[PDB]
A paper describes a structure:
One E3 ligase with a critical role in many immune signalling pathways is TNF receptor-associated factor 6 (TRAF6). TRAF6 preferentially builds Lys63-linked ubiquitin chains by virtue of its interaction with the Ubc13-Uev1A (also called Ube2N-Ube2V1) E2 complex following engagement of receptors. To identify the essential features that regulate ubiquitin chain assembly by TRAF6 we have determined structures of the RING and ZF domains of TRAF6 bound to the Ubc13~Ub conjugate in two crystal forms at 3.4 and 3.9 Å. Both structures show that the Ubc13~Ub conjugate contacts both protomers of the TRAF6 dimer.
Residue numbers in the entry:
A (entry chain D): 55 to 213
B (entry chain E): 3 to 151
C (entry chain F), E (entry chain C): 1 to 76
D (entry chain A): 55 to 158
F (entry chain B): 4 to 151
The structure:
């Protein structure tokens, strides 16, 4: 359940969740002095029993607290985009914001729900994506490139 | 969905091998592991190479891996079916534990057999009452079944 | 001196010792670095469980040798 | 009241107490999300009031918790002796052990 | 541009921004690194109390400039 | 001469702020001779105002003691130089340092407040007759806070 993302430099084990083995998503510390993802440790309390997994001390839903100091230092760690050609780095914090406008990202089409690279979705109006809306040359009517064949009924433009 | 935990663990087992423990995933199933552990130093089993088979259930790591010996081994805590009487695998499993720590404990178990909490009752009884004979048969079983494979 | 120890999760730490140290005080240096109390630690090396009474030189441990730490709750 | 000592390399800001400005003795963290010595923050709630010193946010005796994780980390930082011509280096943890058997 | 900020404790944080960033944003980027909510921040620069709506260019802040953080002016 | 004070001293001696000067007395290590400059765009442009700052036995758990030893026409500063400022008036934080105090004093000169006054007479004129109050502020700056 933790932060699954390529860190560079790679994640120091102090921010590594000993259950899921990732960057600590909503990090929580135990009284015995343990760092876990809230979600992970709370399942470990559910299915494995009421104990800290690492030292066999006693543990419960209540007495764990959020390590807010550790969580912020976590989101400041530099990470790489997870789309193909990205070649770019940023703080983990703004991975989400960057994936919106990744240069090399893949975005399904508004019109054709065929997935398309962000660079080329700009070029995916002029060159017809198969449901893109052509404007008749020499009669001036709006129709969807899918339905051309039937518009060839209606270029008998009176006066 | 081949959960990151398992993957991360897998490529560490190959890259940072524990001395005398080999563990590789099956070419078919990523959760199934062909294991070989060495008969440890100064033990009954020294010179031995023991095949085991370890499998990760879908619960993992919230439930323990299921592992058995495929090689025959004279040991009070391993039955004819190769099931192992070792706490890690029974109750009070912990999701902090990893495959490495399982296999290391099995290696440890070969150095330190336990007649008092037996599984092979015939063997443990032998081990308590007549230890030297049991240990000598142990080296022979090692010799017959855990070399040249 | 300066021995290696692989904790439960995979972390590799280093501990400054001398060969005539007990396993007891090694397990104390683990607790100080890693929070696990000595009662819950089990130390492995070349497939042997290291016992609380004996020393490091009694097991022929040396420079840069990697101990492995695992958990207890045994005899089940 | 925090760990007054020569750290080397020198103490980084994350283990420094905003109140005393020294290594976090028995560190405690707020739910707000910052750190203080147990003694120091508890004095800040005695006198300066029920607030976090660094945010003006709510803070009570009850919701302080010990950042035990931080505390080790701190005791694992290497430090120098404080008697005159010593120049021995060590983990902070055994500073008191060494100053019992120290030279000057 | 990178600009310096001195928190209450005295240690120095450095932040990446451009001149068309509002103070609102600077306080939000301070919050992310120090946990002090935007309400509870007051930034002083060259003895001037900086206001939320306006921008860095409205107070002509340049590269390598040091902002100073204090607590909210809650007069009494 | 407790550690918090010493560190804080040499911290602000090495990192001095634009137009704030603060040095301990040779005699008493808790008494600081302070001068703060009139800020940019302020009524007090070009002014140099002395201050007596002192750290009490309590510090840092209590706020420092601060007075203006130069006369200044300002609705939050009385004729004795006593100051109405949130930090050291009432709710204080032991996180706060001399550095932050002095900055907040500077920030007070940048933002005079008739609605949270100490000099009741000044703030009255400051609210109803801003223009004149500012001109008098400038005149007091020029008479008292130059070449001293
Ligand atoms: K930390
Ligand atoms: Zn986790
Ligand atoms: Zn624990
Ligand atoms: Zn990208
Ligand atoms: Zn399309
Ligand atoms: Zn047409
Ligand atoms: Zn403190
Ligand atoms: Zn010394």
């Amino acid at each position: 359940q933790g932060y699954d993302v390529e860190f560079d430099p790679p994640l120091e084990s102090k921010y590594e969740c000993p259950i899921c083995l990732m960057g600590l998503r909503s990090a929580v510390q135990t009284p015995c002095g343990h760092r876990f993802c809230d979600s992970c440790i709370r399942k470990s309390i559910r299915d494995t029993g009421q104990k800290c997994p690492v030292d066999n001390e006693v543990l419960l839903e209540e007495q764990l607290f959020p390590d807010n100091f550790a969580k912020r230092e976590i989101l400041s760690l530099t990470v790489k985009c997870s789309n193909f050609g990205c070649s770019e780095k940023m703080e983990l914090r703004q991975l989400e914001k960057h994936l919106s406008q990744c240069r090399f990202a893949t975005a399904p089409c508004p019109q054709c729900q065929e997935s398309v690279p962000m660079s080329h979705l700009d070029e995916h109006k002029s060159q017809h994506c198969l449901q893109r809306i052509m404007t008749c040359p020499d009669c001036a009517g709006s129709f969807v490139y899918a339905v051309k064949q039937s518009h060839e009924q209606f270029c008998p433009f009176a006066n | 969905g081949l959960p990151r935990r398992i993957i991360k663990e897998t490529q560490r087992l190959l890259a940072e091998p524990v001395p005398g423990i080999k563990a590789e995933p099956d070419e078919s199933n990523a959760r199934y592991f062909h294991v070989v552990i060495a008969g440890p130093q100064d033990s009954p089993f020294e010179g031995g190479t023991f095949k085991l088979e370890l499998f990760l259930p879908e619960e993992y790591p919230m439930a323990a891996p299921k592992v058995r010996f495929m090689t025959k081994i004279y040991h009070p805590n391993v039955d004819k079916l190769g099931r192992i009487k070792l706490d890690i695998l029974t109750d009070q499993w912990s999701p902090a534990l990893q495959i490495r720590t399982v296999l290391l404990s099995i290696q440890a178990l070969l150095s330190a057999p336990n007649p008092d909490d037996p599984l092979a009752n015939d063997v443990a009884e032998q081990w308590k009452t007549n230890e030297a004979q049991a240990i000598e048969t142990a080296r022979a079983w090692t010799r017959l079944y855990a070399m040249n494979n | 001196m300066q021995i290696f120890v692989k904790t439960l999760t995979g972390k590799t730490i280093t501990l400054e010792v001398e060969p005539s140290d007990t396993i007891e005080n090694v397990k104390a240096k683990i607790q100080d670095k890693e929070g696990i109390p000595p009662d819950q630690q089990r130390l492995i090396f070349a497939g042997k469980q290291l016992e609380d009474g004996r020393t490091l030189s009694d097991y022929n441990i040396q420079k840069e040798s990697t101990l492995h730490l695992v958990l207890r709750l045994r005899g089940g």
